[PDB]
Amino acid sequence: FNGLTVLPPLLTDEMIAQYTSALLAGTITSGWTFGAGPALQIPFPMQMAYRFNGIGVTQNVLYENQKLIANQFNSAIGKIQDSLSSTP
Amino acid sequence: SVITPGTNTSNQVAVLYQGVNCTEVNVFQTRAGCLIGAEYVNSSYECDIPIGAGICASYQTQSIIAYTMSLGAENSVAYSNNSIAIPTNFTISVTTEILPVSMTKTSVDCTMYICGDSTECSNLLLQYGSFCTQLKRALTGIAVEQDKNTQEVFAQVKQIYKTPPIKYFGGFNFSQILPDPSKPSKRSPIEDLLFNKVTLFNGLTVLPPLLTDEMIAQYTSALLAGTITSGWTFGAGPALQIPFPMQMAYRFNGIGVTQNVLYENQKLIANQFNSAIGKIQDSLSSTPSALGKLQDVVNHNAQALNTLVKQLSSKFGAISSVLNDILSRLDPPEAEVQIDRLITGRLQSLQTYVTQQLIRAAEIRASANLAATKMSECVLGQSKRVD
Amino acid sequence: DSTECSNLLLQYGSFCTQLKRALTGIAVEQDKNTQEVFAQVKQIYKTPP
Amino acid sequence: QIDRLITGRLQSLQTYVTQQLIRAAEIRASANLAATKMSECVLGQSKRVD
Amino acid sequence: LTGTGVLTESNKKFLPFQQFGRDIADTTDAVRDPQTLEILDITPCSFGGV
Amino acid sequence: AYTNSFTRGVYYPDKVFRSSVLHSTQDLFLPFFSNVTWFHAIHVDNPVLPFNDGVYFASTEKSNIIRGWIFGTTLDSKTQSLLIVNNATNVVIKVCEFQFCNDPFLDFRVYSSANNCTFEYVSQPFLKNLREFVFKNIDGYFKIYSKHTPIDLPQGFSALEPLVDLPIGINITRFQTLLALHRSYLTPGDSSSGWTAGAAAYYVGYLQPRTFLLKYNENGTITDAVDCALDPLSETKCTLKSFTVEKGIYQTSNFRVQPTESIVRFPNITNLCPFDEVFNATRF
Known part of the structure; x- marks a missing residue:
């Protein structure tokens, strides 16, 4: 070069991925609580029932369709990677 | 490094x-x-x-x-398909957030800054066009904008609500935030600490703000009295009075806790709130750079003016920096090309200053918009938006 | 790295100081954006086996 | 003859720095939006539409 | 030393080998008389926008 | 001998008053912690030292054994040398191309050939007491700064004040000192025997172009200074313009390895043309 430079970033890629994994583990095992204070563990089906009530659908609707709901979620997550890769 | x-x-x-x-x-x-x-x-x-x-x-x-x-630290929370962790106690805390709202209004005189009332230089600068009209217009736009930012943030309430004289609100102690009638400035103790904690020509002038410090302090007192005596209602229409413990029970229900939890721990809750307000002032005073943003705005503005004034001494390649010597020890034919350099250099310096001010003013406007949103949503109501 | 040119650039003022200051402000700002976005959580939570 | 080169290269470097300041402001706006989305959508559940 | 301004009796102690006075940013603030050796303050006469 | 010069040799460079402010100046200063040559004022008389750019001459003595200096491009009368001679009554400054002896005379008040003086000047004299002097000659003027301080070089800081600005424009290249002695013999030439004199000593240092950060006090006098290129911490101070730097990382400067050699490369050969066919012709 002729006097220019590209100083390196303080957080390396590995440390950012570590932060992201921390957030995912927190949200899967503790829901909202870890963002308001001490992380309190709650079973994942009950956490999703909480969220269903949050959008105005009674939670029994989730307990009666747990199998179907899980299948739909898995199929969507599987199609996400293919979609990102095929999109130019 | x-x-x-x-x-x-x-x-x-x-x-x-x-x-x-x-x-x-x-x-x-x-x-x-x-x-x-x-x-x-x-x-x-x-x-x-x-x-x-x-x-x-x-x-x-x-x-x-x-x-x-x-x-x-690594915390491996014990997950299990049939276990739940529930809280048995609480603690209410107070957090201080600081946000800059405005900057110093500046006005500039083209001819004075360029060549200090010299006839030979003005006769030659008149040939350069309308650069100062553009510069003056840009700076005046910035100034009126600063006034508008203060308006949008603070002048949200229409009526100046007064605080009742008997200052008993069910155990809560607001003395640290309510205005003190003793001091003549009528600022609360936290406001006084803030004003003392932060501290700080050639045709460049600083214009004063439209709202003086006193009128803004009066607006702030209006919002505090309104929220203490009327809750949410004063932001939605006519202020409806409600006892302060019931107002706090309403808010507890808002976060999903039944109100009996508040009526049985009124004493404990009031004690925790009082303790946090007491620690707030000590924290603001002991932290060395708690007010970094306000101090930084002030320092940037001062430094900008300093560099603009100092750059008049530079020669930019001419044989001398003072106009008088150039016009004294040289014939007009050579003084022309020796004065072109000084003019062009001082004009470029002023142009750079104005561009830097435009960018900083956009940044401060974004910050002021955020401050106004926070006022509306957090003070005049209760927000469920997380963090 | 020309001696005659530096002797001539020294008369122009503090333009270079200003430029260096501006770029340093940008760099520290870029670092701050990542911190504010990602470093929100305080404890590194581990996933159960 | 060296004045011309000096002034021209100084003006070019000045232009580069100004463009970079504007783009940095734009990216800062985007980063603030990303931080908001993290707080509101990931660490909780939002009723804000779309 | 050529300039314009109002001259006022000074209160600053110039050391004996000095002839000029300066504030921050090279503003010529004072001068000693070459005849009576008195220190004089320089202030630019009043100006402003209308 | 040798001895490090402590934080000494700094002087008021521009005769402009400044109060409670820091100022950065690029001028010919004596780098701090630089070694300076040491000589004694006993006997032999003294060899010539070149006048590269400026001399910081310090002397701790109590008998006036050193009384003047001589500058010029040569000691012979072939050029307008300079003379500066102190005395108990007055200073005599002269510019007259006065021829000197093979060695300067030991004071019997003068020893030189004829003169054609062009400049002359006289004024009051320059007099455990540490006398310090800085001699500079750049812009057609020869300038002297000086200071006399209470008391080897002390660690205390103290700046020199401008004493004289002479208009003489002689091209100065070498310089020597002048000594004296009580009831001493004088001859045009002498050995290293010398004559008895009091115990005394004088140091010599050479000025160099440096950037210095000077601190002015509330009364307009310099109290501290920072050599901007001594060590990395000093350079950091010069960039922040502050004697106290807070915790952090600061970008002070840039480095660039200099080229170690120079090469020129042309087209292998140097094919000629008919010269050996115009000069060796058989018949013209």
């Missing part, structure tokens, strides 16, 4: 050669460059002097140690 733990701690220093490997300059190699004068330690700490690529440095306490950052 130089790594220093502070003149008042010690004179030791470490040097970082950034774009090089030590093979062609203690010694240490890093992705950021070759680091000399600091020893690499295997322990990871919360880092304070950032070097780069995940490496930091700090004062050992007697030596400067370089290390990789630690991203916090």
Whole structure:
């Protein structure tokens, strides 16, 4: 070069991925609580029932369709990677 | 680059050669460059002097140690398909957030700054066009904008609500935030601490703000009295009075806790609130850079004016910086080309100053919009938006 | 790295100081954006086995 | 003859720095939005539409 | 030393080998008389926008 | 001998008053912690030292054994040398191309050939007491700064004040000192025997172009200074313009390895043309 430079970033890629994994583990095992204070563990089906009530659908609707709901979620997550890769 | 733990701690220093490997300059190699004068330690700490690529440095306490950052402690919460953790107690805390709202209004005189009332220079500057009309227009737009920012943030309430004389609100102690009638300025103690904690021509003038400090303090007192006596209602229409403990029970229900929890712990809750307000003032005074944003706006503005005034002494290639000598010790034919340089240099300097001010003014406007949103949503109501 | 040119650039003022200051402000700002976005959580939570 | 080169290269470097300041402001706006989305959508559940 | 301004009796102690006075940013603030050796303050006469 | 010069040799460079402010100036200063040559004022008389750029002459003596200086491009009368001679009554400054002896005379008040003086000046004299002097000659003027301080070089800081600005424009290249002695013999030439004199000593240092950060006090006098290129911490101070630097990382400067050699490369040969066919012709 002729006097220019590209100083390196303080957080390396590995440390950012570590932060992201921390957030995912927190949200899967503790829901909202870890963002308001001490992380309190709650079973994942009950956490999703909480969220269903949050959008105005009674939670029994989730307990009666747990199998179907899980299948739909898995199929969507599987199609996400293919979609990102095929999109130019 | 130089790594220093502070003149008042010690004179030791470490040097970082950034774009090089030590093979062609203690010694240490890093992705950021070759680091000399600091020893690499295997322990990871919360880092304070950032070097780069995940490496930091700090004062050992007697030596400067370089290390990789630690991203916090690891907490393996016990997950299980049939276990739940529920809280049995609470604690209410108070957090202080600071936001800058406006900057100093500046006005500039083209001809004076350029060539200090010299006839020969004005006759020649008149040939350059309408650059000052543009410059003056840009700065005046910035000034009126600053006034508008203060307006949008503070002048939200229409009526000046007064605080009742009997200041009993069910155990809660608002003395640290309500205005003090003793002092003549009528500012609360926290406001006084803030005003004391932060402190600070050639045709350049600073215009005063439209709302004086007193009128803004009066608006703030209006919002406090309104929210203490009327809750949410005063932002939605006519202020409806409601006892303060019931107002807090309403808010508890808002976060999903039944109100009996508040009526049985009124004493405990009031004690916790009073303690937090007491610790707020001490925290603001002991932190060395708690008010970094306001202090920084002031310092940037002062430094900008300083550089603009100082650059008049530079010669820019002419044989001298003062106009008089140029017109004294040289004939007009050579003084023309010797005065062109001074004019062009001083004009470019003023142009750069105005552009920097435009960018900073856009940034402060974004910040002021955020402050107004926070006023509406957090003070005049209760927000469920997280964090 | 020309001696005659530096002797001539020294008369122009503090333009270079200003430029260096501006770029340093941008760099520290870029670092701050990542911190504010990602470093929100305080404890590194581990996933159960 | 060296004045011309000096002034021209100084003006070019000045232009580069100004463009970089504007782009940095734009990216800062985007980063603030990303931080908001993290707080509101990931660490909780939002009723804000779309 | 050529300039314009109002001259006022000074209160600053110039050391005996000095002839000029300066504030921050090279503003010529004072001058000693070459006849009576008295220190004089310089202030630019009043100006402003209308 | 040798001895490090402590934080000494700094002087008021511009005769402009400044109060409670820091100022950075690029001028010919004596780098701090630099070694300076040491000589004694006993006997032999003294060899010539070149006048590269400026001299910081310090002397701790109590008998007036050193009384003047001589500057010029040569000691012979072939050029307008300079003379500066102190005395108990007055100073005599002269510019007259006065021829000197093979060695300067030991004071019997003068020893030189004829003169054609062009400049002359006289004024009051320059007099455990440490006398310090800085001699500079750049812009057609020869300038002297000086200071006399209470008391080897002390660690205390103290700046020199401008004493004289002479208009003489002689091209100065070498310089010597002048001594004296009570009831001493004088001859055009002498050995290293010398004559008895009091115990005394004088140091010599050479000025160099440096950037210095000077601190002015509330009364307009310099109290501290920072050599901007001594060590990395000093350079950091010069960039922040502050004697106290806080914790952090600061970008002070840039480094660049200099080229070690120079090469020129042309087209292998140097094919000629008919010269050996115009000069060796058989018949013209």
